[PDB]
Design a protein around this ligand. Structure first.
Ligand code: MAN
Ligand code: CA
Ligand code: MN
Lengths: 47, 181
C-alpha cells in the first residue's frame, strides 16, 4: 500500500464562480497513454 | 443549506448524468478520457452545476470527491501527459491540449480561466514543471504551473484510489493517492 498526500490553501471564493461544473480531463501529445476512471463519488454542502 | 451528492461505482455505456468532451466516452465498467494515441484530449463533467460558494453569505462549500483511475501506457517509460480533477465555470470547454492537460492555456496566472485542478502529471514540461523531472501530483490554480507539487511514482496499469477534500473552514485542499502495492 503506497500512499501520497499533498495539501495547500486555495481560496476557492476568489478563483472560481459561485456555480461550477466538476470533471476530469486527460491529454496526450507527442507521447501518450490511456487514461480511465473506474468509479467516482462526490459530496458538497454549502451552509 | 444546499448539498449535491452522487456515487457511480461502475460506469455504463449510457451515462447520461455526465457531459463528454473531446474523446471522452464510457463503456461497460469504465470511463475513458483518452486512448493511447497521440495528441488527444478527453473530458467528462458531472451534468449538474454545483453551488460552491455564495456571494450573499460569503459561505464556501466543504466537499469531498473520491475516484479510482488507471493510466495504461503502451511505452512504460515514455508517458504523457496526465489526468486532472478540475472545478471550472459552468460553460467550461477543453482548453490547450498536451502539457496543458486540456484545462489551461499558459504558465502565467490567468484569472479569466477560473479553474482549480489537481493534476497527476506524467510528463516533464521544462517550461514549467518541477526541475527534479519527477512525475507528480500538483495543485493548479488558473495556471499549468502548480502552486505545489509532490513527486509520485506512477504504477503503470494499476488502480489508484484518490480522495480530494476541501475544508471550507481552513481553505485547505487535500489530495491523497493510494496504490494497492
Ligand atoms: O506529450 C508530451 C509533449 O508532447 C509535445 O511536446 C507537446 O504536445 C507537449 O505539450 C506535450 O507535453
Ligand atoms: Ca507535464
Ligand atoms: Mn505538472
Amino acid at each position: 500500500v503506497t500512499s501520497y498526500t499533498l495539501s495547500d490553501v486555495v481560496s476557492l471564493k476568489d478563483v472560481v464562480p459561485e456555480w461550477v461544473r466538476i470533471g476530469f480531463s486527460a491529454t496526450t501529445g507527442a507521447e501518450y497513454a490511456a487514461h480511465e476512471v473506474l468509479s467516482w463519488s462526490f459530496h458538497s454542502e454549502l451552509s | 443549506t444546499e448539498t449535491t451528492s452522487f456515487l457511480i461505482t461502475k460506469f455504463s455505456p449510457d451515462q447520461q448524468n455526465l457531459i463528454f468532451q473531446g474523446d471522452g466516452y464510457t463503456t461497460k465498467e469504465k470511463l475513458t478520457l483518452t486512448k493511447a494515441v497521440k495528441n488527444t484530449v478527453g473530458r467528462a463533467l458531472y451534468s449538474s452545476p454545483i453551488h460552491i460558494w455564495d456571494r450573499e453569505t460569503g459561505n464556501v462549500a466543504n466537499f469531498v470527491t473520491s475516484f479510482t483511475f488507471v493510466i495504461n501506457a503502451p511505452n512504460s517509460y515514455n508517458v504523457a501527459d496526465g489526468f486532472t480533477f478540475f472545478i471550472a465555470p459552468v460553460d467550461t470547454k477543453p482548453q490547450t491540449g498536451g502539457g496543458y492537460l486540456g484545462v489551461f492555456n499558459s504558465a502565467e496566472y490567468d484569472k479569466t480561466t477560473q479553474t482549480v485542478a489537481v493534476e497527476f502529471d506524467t510528463f516533464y514540461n521544462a517550461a514549467w514543471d518541477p526541475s527534479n523531472r519527477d512525475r507528480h501530483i500538483g495543485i493548479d490554480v488558473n495556471s499549468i504551473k502548480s502552486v505545489n507539487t509532490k513527486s509520485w511514482k506512477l504504477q503503470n496499469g494499476e488502480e489508484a484510489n484518490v480522495v480530494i477534500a476541501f475544508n471550507a473552514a481552513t481553505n485547505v485542499l487535500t489530495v491523497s493517492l493510494t496504490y494497492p502495492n
